[model samples]
Target: NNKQYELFMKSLIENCKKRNMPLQSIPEIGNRKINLFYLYMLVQKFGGADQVTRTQQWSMVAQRLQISDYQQLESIYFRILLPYERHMISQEGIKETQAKRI
Candidate 1:
């Protein structure tokens, strides 16, 4: 278990760099490409764009940063990003989809 955890952590860092999935699972997480993209985006906002991309070269951002306040990161990710991403997938009556399609 511990080994797997370490592996996952290593894979996560690799994913951040290569923007690809590292491992497969019994119940596939389904589209880790998108997940890693969003995760990288969120980390970019939380830390900085440069910092996130630098994740591979320096895999210590999480350890070094201190977000004293939560603010609305969670809400933004869940409510805003989730709906926006879903809207993109739907490609129907979603305004975001229309805008992106342009």
Candidate 2:
């Protein structure tokens, strides 16, 4: 499960980087939390809440989502972000802090 989680995060980071989205670790301590809206989009793209309840394996999620290529992943990512452009910037710091706990 730990390994799978790492792989899942790795894939997300890689795909986001490919699309020039920011994905990074949080500081040890900070006043403001980071908002990782992209990660939320990732969850949503792969079946959203249903997927969260279904499995913990990144491989399984990837296979089920038909996300074999980075190009396809980035496409979905940007599409998801398109609707939330305004909120993305403001929410990023908050999301980053939340992600640290997760």
lDDT values, one for every candidate? 0.33, 0.38
Q: Poorest 10 consecutive residues of model 1 by lDDT?
A: 25-34
TM-score of each: 0.20, 0.26
lDDT of 1 at 7: 46
Q: Looking at model 2, which ten-residue stretch has the lowest summed lDDT?
A: 27-36
Candidate 2, pairs of clashing residues: 33-93, 34-92, 34-93, 34-96, 34-97, 35-92, 35-93, 35-95, 35-96
Question: lDDT by residue for model 1 over 1-102, one digit each (tens)?
Answer: 535545434544443334332223211123232232234244544343333334442232222222222222322223223233222334537453366557
Question: Candidate 2 regions off by >4 Å?
Answer: 23-102
Candidate maximizing TM-score:
2
Model 2 scores a C-alpha lDDT of 0.38
lDDT of 2 by residue, 40-76 (tens): 3444544433333344532332343544333323333
74 Cα displacement, candidate 2 (Å): 14
